[PDB]
Design a protein around this motif. Structure first.
Motif, short mmCIF file in Angstrom:
data_model
loop_
_atom_site.label_atom_id
_atom_site.label_comp_id
_atom_site.label_asym_id
_atom_site.label_seq_id
_atom_site.Cartn_x
_atom_site.Cartn_y
_atom_site.Cartn_z
N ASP A 1 0.87 -1.22 -0.03
CA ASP A 1 0.12 0.32 0.03
C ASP A 1 0.98 1.08 0.07
N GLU A 2 0.30 2.42 -0.39
CA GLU A 2 0.87 3.71 -0.41
C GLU A 2 1.08 3.93 1.37
N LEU A 3 2.15 4.73 1.50
CA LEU A 3 2.47 5.23 2.92
C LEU A 3 1.47 5.97 3.43
N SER A 4 1.02 6.16 4.78
CA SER A 4 0.02 6.85 5.54
C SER A 4 0.73 8.27 5.79
N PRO A 5 -0.09 9.29 5.89
CA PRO A 5 0.55 10.36 6.27
C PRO A 5 1.18 10.43 7.46
N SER A 6 1.18 9.59 8.56
CA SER A 6 1.74 9.13 9.69
C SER A 6 3.08 8.79 9.34
N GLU A 7 3.34 8.14 8.51
CA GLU A 7 4.60 7.50 8.08
C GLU A 7 5.51 8.00 7.21
N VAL A 8 4.88 9.07 6.36
CA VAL A 8 5.85 9.91 5.35
C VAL A 8 6.06 11.16 6.25
N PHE A 9 5.47 11.63 7.28
CA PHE A 9 6.02 12.40 8.05
C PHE A 9 6.94 12.00 8.92
N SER A 10 6.99 10.95 9.42
CA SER A 10 8.12 10.23 10.32
C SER A 10 9.55 10.05 9.21
N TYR A 11 9.29 9.75 8.03
CA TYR A 11 10.46 9.97 7.11
C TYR A 11 10.82 11.30 7.07
N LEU A 12 10.00 12.39 7.16
CA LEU A 12 10.44 13.50 6.90
C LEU A 12 11.22 14.05 8.32
N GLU B 1 7.15 -7.44 15.70
CA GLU B 1 5.81 -7.66 16.32
C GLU B 1 4.92 -8.29 15.41
N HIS B 2 5.06 -8.35 14.13
CA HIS B 2 3.92 -8.69 13.13
C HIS B 2 4.88 -9.87 12.23
N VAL B 3 6.03 -10.03 12.35
CA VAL B 3 6.70 -11.04 11.61
C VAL B 3 7.48 -12.24 12.21
N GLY B 4 7.61 -13.53 11.95
CA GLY B 4 8.29 -14.48 12.44
C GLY B 4 8.50 -15.50 11.52
N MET B 5 9.58 -16.50 11.79
CA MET B 5 10.13 -17.41 10.89
C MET B 5 10.33 -18.79 11.46
N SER B 6 10.31 -19.85 10.82
CA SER B 6 10.77 -21.12 11.36
C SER B 6 11.95 -21.77 10.22
N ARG C 1 10.98 0.46 11.30
CA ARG C 1 10.18 1.03 11.98
C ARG C 1 10.90 2.30 12.82
N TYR C 2 12.43 2.41 12.86
CA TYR C 2 12.82 3.74 13.07
C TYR C 2 12.37 4.73 12.09
N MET C 3 12.37 4.49 10.88
CA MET C 3 12.18 5.52 10.01
C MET C 3 10.56 5.88 9.83
N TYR C 4 9.72 4.65 9.57
CA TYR C 4 8.37 5.13 9.31
C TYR C 4 7.37 4.86 10.53
N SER C 5 7.89 4.31 11.75
CA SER C 5 7.18 4.18 12.79
C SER C 5 6.01 3.27 12.79
N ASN C 6 6.25 2.35 11.75
CA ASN C 6 5.10 1.41 11.61
C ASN C 6 5.76 0.06 11.44
N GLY C 7 5.20 -1.11 11.34
CA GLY C 7 5.61 -2.48 10.79
C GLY C 7 5.80 -2.56 9.09
N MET C 8 6.66 -3.23 8.97
CA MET C 8 7.24 -3.42 7.65
C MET C 8 6.29 -4.27 6.88
#
Ligand SMILES: Cc1nc(C)c(C(=O)Nc2ccc(F)c(-c3nc4ncc(-c5ncccc5C)cn4n3)c2)o1
Ligand SMILES: *[B]([O])([O])[C]([C][C]([C])[C])[N]C(=O)[C]([C]C1=[C][C]=[C][C]=[C]1)[N]C(=O)C1=[C]N=[C][C]=N1
Lengths: 201, 206, 204, 218, 229, 214, 238, 235, 230
Positions: free
Chosen positions: D76-87, G66-71, G94-101
């Motif tokens: 999916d496309e990045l949300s606004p909360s995630e592209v502000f985090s890259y910013l 938190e959302h990934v795991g492997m065997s 998660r450092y850059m985007y503050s969400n799961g990959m």
């Protein structure tokens, strides 16, 4: 800070205050100014609070790794030379630390002293810190080599007190150690205000 | 500079003397610290300066003379070869990262023939040095605050044919002048001497 | 300044089939005499004699690198170094360290053994080549020597009468400079011989 | 080239963001006809107060990050909360390299109901609110934006949040030197970000105390 | 990246890789040189593979500086690494001593480039020899390096195909007091007796180093010499 | 341009017998303006039993909270899922503040957690990592208001009277509200609303509180 | 066979044997079964049974985020070098985007990690297979990498020694995985895992690792204590 | 032999140099480890080459910290650099975390070094061969007594009773019986010295083997003396 | 012998076998086809699924390189993903440095130099992959094929894979001048269902992608209901 320590017939007695001031504000009043390096060494603290607690924890790591590899205890002539080579390597980096190492190796006592500039000296009588100039005049008047164990503990506890009373950067709780041949023991631990109504009742 | 080093060479000896004062900006730490490092059995150096670079320079020089005797089967190098190795470490340190050594030193020694084919120097050797890397062979050299008091004293009284006792009472005059005019309290002076039988620690003049 | 820290003045004059070179005898630390019997001259062969002035730490370190390079030149090339090749060699040494520069000012005098032509050269501390046909001079009393040498020189001088001009020029300039003096050591040199003379001076 | 004050506010359903279309150079107003509202991807938009060359290189970087993550992979496309985090992490990286992105920014974005409004400084400060103003709009226009969010805690509609931005842009023309009367308003809603045609505000200069004889110093 | 050596020792104790490279350096065309009391002549043989290969473009006598020249016989493209390193090392001498290089010191430097690739990792030796000749402050010189790095100080020599029977012809024709014009007279004459056809001004190339300078002879000055022998 | 900037606020904590109360006001401010009133980025959770509570510069605060966040995760991955204690985290804090000694953070830190025995201990740090275990701690712009106040009512010194019994969670919470209602009156960089965290062995409960808006 | 020694050597039939030899390491490791549902992915690994009292433990199932795991299956020393890379690149996300990959980005990142090691001469392939159990905004994912560099998006799969029989069981129930609840989805994974065991052994809490990731469920490894609720009542019926 | 490479797989899926290093463990001295709820005992034969060797110089048991011991098998020259690495890692943990390193994380810090080998260096200088030593790490932590094995594959495995070395195949048959999970430590003493008597070729004396324990209630490593090893034999 | 063990070895007649052995990895791979339809380019490939349980969308051999271009690979899938991740880097450079979309003939010439640079050095092996660059840049619709030797060529239509000889004759019956992108998705997919046999594999489906003016010059995959059923 008014750390002192002296060497006599019976071992080495280390005596400190417990005050850390960042200028005219007192940050804390229960600072341990003796990092015991292991069960037969001691290290003292003066100057920067983080510069002392870091590199004497580095010194406590190089003394533990000595015993793992060589199977025997480290001497004090090797322990300060570890701390002096570290200190001389960072002499242009603006460190501020003045530390005494004291211990019982297989050659008896030895009381060294390391600057923040790489110096290492070997005497039997030191007093370091900003208020140390008050702790010399009461100690040099009453020091002699063949003191007893109780009188040299009394001379150390009384020589800290007259510098905590006069210097603004010194005070708190006077801690006295004794380095005998089996290691070190914490002799006493008492407040400076309680110690005023003992020496001047 | 607060502590003085006095050295003069004569026909069959080299006197050295270095005040054993160590201080913390006005507070006397010691009064008897040996500042004349015995490098070889016939060579010594009287370094002055603060105690940081002074030990770390002398231990680097002393352990490398001993290493050059390990790798060369115990053959003692000359006094000029040691002195030229020393100023190489002063001159390469004023153009480096860590900075210049703040040590002022007087090298002293006696040249003995190591074999029958050696036809080099027989006499004594005395070298003035500096913290920059200046090297000068000199009849007598002095450092510290009291250097100028005693260099003009040795202009008056030094002779090339002084004996062991006549140069011993000259060094006593050298130590009593520094106690008379210099504000810095130099009370114990550590007089040593280099002769044909090695080094010797003179107890009398202090 | 760092250049006038140690004291000492070195000059050289050119004659008909000869040249002279002369330094003082003082070493110091900005006011005080360290030694009174120290020349500044160096001889590499029977044709080239050069003198260093400036900081004494650099006067000995640079002269070790020159002797490292002159003796390596004689091992590679089976011949003595010439004057134009020696002067262009240590011109390049002072230019490699242009931003960390040596505090020397070499005064080179040389002569051809077979031809008889003199070659003078005095670079700066950054290696600026300059070959006058009359005289060169460096040191702390250098501003006093351009007056003494220029008012007394002539192109056609004998070796015995060129020494008399260079000696009276060094001493009269060192009687006005408080960082140079204490006698002078000269060296006249022709195609046939090298004569080294020590000159009386004021002990002030 | 330097940009002026940028103000933004949330309403019931989306986020509004206004900025003058001026790019001054010191005191000289060089170009009154450049757009400062850049929109990011398909749900968000950013605008800056400060150096324009730093913003033009930064927004070029974070626009390439949205598309290439979306184009290359089946994500999916990045949300606004995630592209502000890259910013935010890209500006903080530049000041630790001692070459910062010397401008304050205002970021808006709406992704399917969840509205996002935040700002970021050249140092690395970030904050989230219902009213963001940078430049001298933080001194002038931001007190007016704060009272109108607390005089109705249920929320502003689009009609009454557009009245108070026009009340704030009018005072920015009165009291900021490096400003003109030509404004664009971004409108991030559930349909997406929509930048309007430049308009102006109605200014009143006709007070009876502004006449020549009253304000005279005789 | 193949840092192992390609040239090693044999159980007989010989560097068999360099022995193969000396065979490769003797399959070129005949290059030669003679000395004199007034100069040194070098002579080449531009073998054209066709009539359409622009004989004025290809060259075998290489001028290195204002006082040094060279001529090879072996692998052509291997030689250009040696000449470009010899033209470079001769300009570094003038930027450091303000003096033309001696012929001794230049040949010591290019012999350290042959030996470098016979002890390096992943390379093969050179397959060509040279004929370095020129002036310096102590007379006239004619040297001859080998693909092993072994250099010599010849007085009249020849390299290539037809070299051992042209070097024996140089023994019979050399004299200790040969002048310079007598040297060019016999350097071209020892090319002819092993040459296949009829040598022209676009077919050979000579260069005679005179008094300070190498100066490859032009097509008009060499045409003066062919109709004289 | 200067790469350091103080963003106000204060944090205070008082540790009890099996709990710690941890507080910090929500107010971000810059040069002379007020950026926000609702910044939750002042107190950060590392483990379920140990928090960090820092203030000073807001930009270097968020960077230090993330490098502390992943050194706990490399601890959890390399030790078989074992969560680090307060003593392990607070020595991790004391080292990383010294590794950046020459270009340091403009943060002033508190690591707040429970012991292995269950008692609560707060630590405090300078800009270069001087640590000490202690029963309370107050950092920020209003530290000189509150740290002498916590000396006078927790230590019970210079008062010739018998000791009160041990403080509960409620009597500690009502005490700590008297400091933030005291720092909102006399400190201009402190106070919009203070958020109280109550760290107990059976999870954490979270409360809020209102201060003066000026 | 002189075309099987080096990694950078094609056969004259156009095959890479060093890649095909590393594929036999995955077929010799322990059997693990991944089953994807509608919102849940269930991994069921078969760890080693005790030797009559003494219990050897060896960690196969890894948590990546938190959302990934492997065997893993095969060389477990390369399965932890992958675990260092996957955990680092999920911390950097998660450092850059503050969400799961997202899982489609991550499966494309493992495949380029296998690819750098299969074209240089002094490198070797990772002789280990994976079973990614992921969840993101696009729902649950189940991947499987092989030492060739491929990455396959499955509905259900099984790798390991004698895992062909577990794959035969999953090829009859894989149409009915978007309809089962979580408790039935664990049961299809354990009935599949029990058909790869030996002739005289069945499943219990001593030889099975059950890992579940979901929509409101982070990646949780159900070991000895909490795994009893799905493993005490279990019988491999014919 | 250099026809193959160091990273060359077999057609059966195995790496050549790792499979050839496991066989170098079977040609070494044997070693033991028994996990018991009071502690872990580490018995090991010394296998002296001659009677002219002082036995305190070839210690098969080395301390990593006060709470972690390590016994090896195979070639002991490679065994030193793994233990010299585990000592540095377990003291950097006390430097950073103010707490003793767990027994699991000291095995993981060793296995990370036992896999770093190749043939092409490039950026990093690698090892030319895998380590021909199988360690066997024991210790106590917050989870109590634990036993771990590092093999030359890089494979770490927690155990309860494991024997490595030459006398390892015969000891696993003895491990099947004669071991319950709630033994005492002194019963774990006499189990190890009976196994180490059976699987060795020489006469078992107190100056022939090495026994060291890490107690649970003590938490510290306690190596034994030859007067202490004899007291286990006469039971 | 040892004359076909690496890439830096010419044969006795001037051939490089490890390149030609890599060309047998494409000839034993699944069937690829393409077509240039005078306003765009259509590319279709057949995914050979080896199991019934693979998710729809797995192992897609068509990847978008830029907005207007995309490379479909034919040969080894993981080797071609190093070509895709390189040509994306070549297309990101022209957007970030030269502020222009990469041209179709220029993107293909950057692919053919990355694939050739691994056929000249001993430490590297050539790709088992034929990359089909389908682009629509400001030079019109382009269709290129890069073989493992590094040879690029503009085509009107191409068949690659196992049955590339039978599918080539099926492309000779199309027009390519009156041919549009509307009809060619039904035509090219009907090539694959006739050129490929079900007596070897049971699971085979097709994956089609285009770039044309109807998709706003964007390289997209199909909507799922435009492909013929069988
Ligand atoms: C052998 C010996 N003899 C003496 C007399 C000494 C000695 O004094 N050595 C020494 C070396 C390094 C140091 F760094 C220090 C040192 N101690 C301090 N204590 C307190 C403050 C301070 N505190 C709070 C506010 C402001 C200040 C300035 C500063 N310093 N600096 C002292 O050594
Ligand atoms: B003693 O008084 O020097 C003592 C030193 C001991 C704790 C190692 N502390 C201090 O007084 C120092 C003074 C200081 C010296 C040099 C530079 C800066 C400060 N105080 C601290 O280091 C300090 C400051 N803030 C908090 C904690 N510690």
């Amino acid at each position: 800070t008014t750390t002192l320590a002296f060497r006599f017939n019976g071992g080495i007695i280390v005596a400190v205050d417990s005050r850390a001031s960042t200028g005219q504000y007192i940050a804390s009043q229960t600072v341990m100014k003796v990092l015991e390096i292991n069960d037969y060494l001691l290290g003292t603290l003066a100057g920067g609070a983080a510069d002392c607690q870091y590199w004497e924890r580095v010194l406590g790591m190089e003394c533990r790794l000595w015993e793992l590899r060589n199977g025997s205890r480290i001497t004090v002539a090797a322990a300060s030379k570890i701390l002096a080579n570290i200190t001389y390597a960072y002499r242009n980096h603006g460190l501020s630390m003045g530390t005494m190492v004291a211990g019982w190796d297989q050659f008896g006592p030895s009381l060294y002293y390391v600057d923040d500039k790489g110096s290492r000296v070997k005497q039997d009588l030191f007093s370091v810190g900003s208020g140390s100039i008050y702790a010399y005049g009461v100690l040099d008047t009453g020091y002699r080599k063949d003191l007893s164990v109780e009188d040299a503990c009394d001379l150390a506890r009384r020589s800290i007190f007259h510098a905590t009373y006069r210097d603004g950067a010194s005070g708190g709780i006077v801690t006295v150690y004794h380095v005998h041949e089996k290691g070190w023991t914490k002799i006493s631990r008492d407040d400076q205000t309680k110690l005023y109504h003992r020496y001047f009742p | 500079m607060a502590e003085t080093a006095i050295a003069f060479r004569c026909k069959d000896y080299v006197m050295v003397a270095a005040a054993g004062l160590n201080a913390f900006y006005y507070i006397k730490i010691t009064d008897a610290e040996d500042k004349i490092t015995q490098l070889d059995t016939h060579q010594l150096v009287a370094c002055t300066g603060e105690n940081g670079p002074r030990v770390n320079f002398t231990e680097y020089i002393k352990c490398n003379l001993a290493l050059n005797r390990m790798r060369q089967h115990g053959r003692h190098s000359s006094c000029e070869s040691t002195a030229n190795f020393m100023r190489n470490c002063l001159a390469s340190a004023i153009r480096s990262r860590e900075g210049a050594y703040q040590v002022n030193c007087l090298f002293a020694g006696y040249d003995t023939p190591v074999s029958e084919d050696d036809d080099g120097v027989v006499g004594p050797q005395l070298f003035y040095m500096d913290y920059l890397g200046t090297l000068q062979a000199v009849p007598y050299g002095c450092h510290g605050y009291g250097a100028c008091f005693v260099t003009a004293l040795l202009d008056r009284l030094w002779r090339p044919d002084l004996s062991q006792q006549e140069g011993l009472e000259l060094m006593q005059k050298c130590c009593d002048e520094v106690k008379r005019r210099v504000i810095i309290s130099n009370s114990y002076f550590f007089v040593k001497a280099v002769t044909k039988n090695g080094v010797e620690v003179i107890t009398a003049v202090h | 300044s760092i250049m006038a820290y140690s004291g000492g003045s070195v000059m050289a004059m050119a004659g008909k089939e000869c040249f002279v070179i002369i330094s003082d005898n003082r070493l110091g630390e900005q006011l005080k005499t360290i030694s009174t019997e120290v020349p500044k001259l160096h001889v590499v062969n029977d044709s080239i004699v050069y003198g260093l002035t400036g900081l004494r730490t650099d006067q000995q370190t640079f002269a070790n690198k020159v002797q490292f390079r002159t003796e390596m030149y004689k091992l590679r090339e089976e011949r003595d170094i010439t004057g134009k090749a020696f002067a262009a060699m240590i011109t390049s040494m002072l230019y490699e360290a242009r931003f960390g520069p040596w505090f020397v000012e070499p005064v080179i005098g040389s002569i051809d053994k077979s031809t008889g032509e003199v070659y003078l050269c005095a670079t700066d501390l950054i290696g600026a080549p300059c070959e006058p046909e009359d005289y060169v001079c460096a040191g702390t009393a250098a501003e006093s020597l351009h007056g003494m040498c220029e008012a007394l020189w002539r192109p056609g001088m004998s070796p015995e009468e060129l020494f008399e001009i260079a000696a009276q020029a060094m001493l009269s300039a060192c009687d006005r400079d408080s960082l140079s003096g204490y006698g002078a050591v000269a060296m006249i040199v022709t195609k046939d011989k090298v004569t080294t003379r020590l000159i009386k001076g004021r002990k002030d | 080239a330097s940009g002026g004050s940028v103000i933004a506010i949330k309403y019931k359903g989306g986020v509004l963001m206004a900025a003058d279309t001026l790019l001054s150079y010191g005191s000289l107003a060089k170009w009154p006809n450049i757009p400062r509202i850049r929109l990011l991807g398909s749900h968000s938009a950013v605008c800056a107060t400060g150096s324009y060359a730093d913003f033009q290189m930064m927004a070029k970087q974070v626009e390439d990050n949205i598309e290439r993550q979306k184009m290359y992979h089946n994500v999916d496309e990045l949300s606004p909360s995630e592209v502000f985090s890259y910013l935010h992490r890209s500006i903080y990286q530049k000041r630790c390299d001692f070459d910062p992105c010397l401008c304050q920014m205002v970021f808006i974005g709406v992704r399917d109901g969840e509205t996002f409004l935040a700002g970021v400084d050249d140092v690395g400060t970030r904050w989230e609110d219902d009213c963001i103003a940078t430049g001298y709009g933080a001194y002038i226009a931001l007190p007016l934006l704060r009272q109108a969010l607390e005089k109705n805690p249920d929320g502003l509609s689009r009609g009454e949040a557009m009245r108070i931005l026009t009340d704030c842009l009018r005072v920015l023309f009165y009291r900021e030197c490096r400003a003109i009367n030509k404004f664009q308003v971004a409108d991030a809603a559930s349909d997406g970000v929509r930048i309007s045609e430049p308009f102006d505000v109605e200014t009143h200069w006709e007070y009876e105390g502004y006449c020549f004889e009253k304000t005279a110093i005789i | 990246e193949a840092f192992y050596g390609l040239t090693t020792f044999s159980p007989s104790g010989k560097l068999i890789q360099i022995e193969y490279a000396t065979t490769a350096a003797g399959k070129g065309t005949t290059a030669l040189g003679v000395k004199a009391t007034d100069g040194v002549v070098i002579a080449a043989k531009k073998k054209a593979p066709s009539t359409l290969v622009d004989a004025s473009s290809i060259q075998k006598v290489f001028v290195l500086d204002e006082h040094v020249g060279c001529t090879y016989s072996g692998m052509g493209p291997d030689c250009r690494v040696l000449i470009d390193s010899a033209r470079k090392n001769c300009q570094q001498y003038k930027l450091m001593y303000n003096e033309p290089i001696p012929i001794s010191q230049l040949v010591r430097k290019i012999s350290a480039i042959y030996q470098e690739f016979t002890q390096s990792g992943g390379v093969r030796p050179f397959g060509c020899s040279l004929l370095v000749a020129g002036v310096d402050a102590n007379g006239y010189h004619l040297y001859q390096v080998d693909p092993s790095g072994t250099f010599w100080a010849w007085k009249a020599t020849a390299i290539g195909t037809g070299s051992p029977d042209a070097k024996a012809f140089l023994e019979k024709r050399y004299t200790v007091d040969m002048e310079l014009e007598d040297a060019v007279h016999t350097a071209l004459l020892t090319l002819k007796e092993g040459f296949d056809g009829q040598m022209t001004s676009e077919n050979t190339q000579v260069g005679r180093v005179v008094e300070n300078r190498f100066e490859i002879l032009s097509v008009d000055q060499l045409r003066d010499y062919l109709d004289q022998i | 341009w200067s790469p350091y900037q103080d963003n106000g606020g204060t944090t205070a904590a008082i540790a009890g017998k099996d709990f710690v109360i941890l507080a910090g006001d929500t107010r971000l401010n810059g040069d002379f303006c007020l950026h926000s009133r609702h910044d939750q980025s002042k107190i950060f959770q590392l483990t379920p039993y140990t928090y960090m509570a820092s203030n000073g510069m807001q930009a270097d605060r968020l960077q230090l909270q993330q490098m502390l966040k992943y050194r706990v995760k490399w601890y959890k991955y390399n030790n078989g899922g074992k969560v680090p204690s307060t003593k392990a985290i607070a020595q991790l804090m004391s080292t990383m503040l010294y590794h950046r000694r020459f270009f340091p953070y403009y943060t002033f830190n508190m690591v707040v957690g429970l012991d292995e025995e269950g008692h609560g201990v707060c630590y405090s740090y300078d800009a270069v990592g001087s640590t000490e275990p202690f029963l309370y701690g107050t950092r920020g712009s209003a530290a000189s208001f509150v740290e002498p106040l916590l000396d006078c009512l927790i230590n019970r010194q210079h008062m010739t009277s018998q000791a009160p019994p041990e403080m509960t969670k409620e009597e500690t919470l009502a005490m700590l509200k008297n400091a933030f209602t005291g720092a909102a009156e006399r400190d201009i960089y402190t106070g919009d609303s203070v958020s109280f965290f109550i760290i107990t062995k059976d999870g954490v409960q979270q409360e809020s509180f209102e201060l003066r808006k000026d | 066979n002189e075309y099987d020694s080096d990694i950078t050597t094609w056969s004259p039939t156009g095959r890479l044997f060093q890649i095909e030899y590393a594929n036999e390491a995955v077929n010799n490791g322990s059997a693990t079964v991944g089953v994807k549902g509608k919102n849940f992915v269930v991994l069921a690994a078969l760890k080693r049974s005790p030797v009559a009292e003494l219990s050897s433990y060896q960690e196969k199932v890894f948590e990546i985020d938190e959302h990934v795991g492997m065997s893993i299956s095969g060389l477990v020393a390369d399965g932890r070098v992958l675990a260092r890379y996957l955990r680092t690149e999920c911390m950097n996300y998660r450092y850059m985007y503050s969400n799961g990959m997202p899982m489609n980005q991550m499966a494309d990142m493992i495949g380029e990690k296998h690819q750098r090691h299969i074209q240089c001469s002094g490198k070797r392939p990772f002789g280990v297979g994976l079973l990614l159990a992921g969840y993101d905004r696009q729902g649950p994912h189940l991947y499987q990498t092989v030492p060739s560099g491929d990455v396959y998006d499955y509905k259900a799969t099984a790798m390991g020694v004698r895992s062909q029989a577990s794959r035969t069981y999953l090829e009859r129930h894989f149409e009915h995985f978007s309809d089962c609840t979580l408790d039935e989805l664990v049961t299809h994974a354990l009935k599949a895992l029990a058909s790869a065991t030996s002739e005289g052994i069945e499943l219990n809490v001593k030889n099975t690792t059950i890992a579940i990731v979901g929509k409101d469920t982070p990646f949780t490894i159900f070991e000895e204590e909490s795994a009893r609720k799905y493993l005490d009542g279990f019988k491999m019926r014919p | 032999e250099y026809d193959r490479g160091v990273n060359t797989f077999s057609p059966e899926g195995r790496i050549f140099q790792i499979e050839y290093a496991v066989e170098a463990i079977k040609l070494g001295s044997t070693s033991l480890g028994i996990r018991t709820p009071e502690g872990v005992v580490l018995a090991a034969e010394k296998r002296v080459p001659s009677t002219l060797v002082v036995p305190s110089s070839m210690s098969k048991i080395m301390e990593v910290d006060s709470h972690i011991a390590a016994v090896m098998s195979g070639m002991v020259a490679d065994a030193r650099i793994l233990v010299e690495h585990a000592r540095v890692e377990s003291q950097n943990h006390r430097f950073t975390y103010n707490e003793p390193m767990s027994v699991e994380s000291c095995t993981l810090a060793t296995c990370d070094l036992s896999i770093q080998f190749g043939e092409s260096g490039g950026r990093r200088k690698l090892m030319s061969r895998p380590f021909g030593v199988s360690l066997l790490i024991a210790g106590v932590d917050e989870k109590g007594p634990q036993l771990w094995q590092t093999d030359p594959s890089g494979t770490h495995t927690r155990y309860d009773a494991q024997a490595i070395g030459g006398g390892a195949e015969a000891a696993q048959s003895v491990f099947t019986e004669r071991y319950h999970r709630n033994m005492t430590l002194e019963e774990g003493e006499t189990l190890a010295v009976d196994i180490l008597k059976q699987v060795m070729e020489d006469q078992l004396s107190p100056e022939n083997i090495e026994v060291a324990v890490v107690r649970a209630d003590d938490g510290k490593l306690h190596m034994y003396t030859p007067t202490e090893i004899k007291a286990i034999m006469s039971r | 012998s040892g004359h076909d063990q690496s890439t830096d070895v010419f044969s006795a007649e001037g051939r490089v076998f490890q390149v030609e052995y890599a060309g047998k990895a494409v000839d034993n791979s699944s069937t690829a086809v393409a077509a240039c339809c005078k306003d765009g380019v259509v590319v279709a490939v057949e995914k050979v699924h080896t199991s019934r349980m693979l998710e729809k969308g797995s192992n897609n051999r068509i990847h978008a390189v830029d907005r207007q271009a995309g490379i479909c690979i034919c040969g080894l899938l993981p080797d071609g993903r190093a070509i895709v991740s390189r040509a994306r880097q070549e297309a990101e450079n022209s957007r970030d440095i030269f502020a222009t979309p990469i041209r179709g003939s220029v993107l293909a010439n950057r692919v053919g130099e990355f694939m050739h640079a691994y056929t000249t050095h001993f430490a590297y092996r050539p790709f088992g992959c034929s990359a089909i660059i389908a682009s629509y840049a400001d030079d019109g619709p382009q269709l290129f094929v890069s073989d493992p030797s590094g040879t690029v060529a503009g085509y009107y239509g191409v068949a690659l894979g196992k049955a590339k000889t039978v599918a080539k004759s099926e492309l000779e019956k199309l027009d390519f001048s009156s041919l549009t992108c509307d009809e060619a998705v039904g035509k090219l997919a009907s090539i694959l269902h006739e050129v490929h046999d079900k007596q070897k594999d049971k699971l085979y489906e097709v994956e089609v992608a285009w770039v044309c003016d109807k998709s706003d010059r964007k390289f997209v995959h199909v909507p799922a209901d435009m492909v013929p059923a069988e």
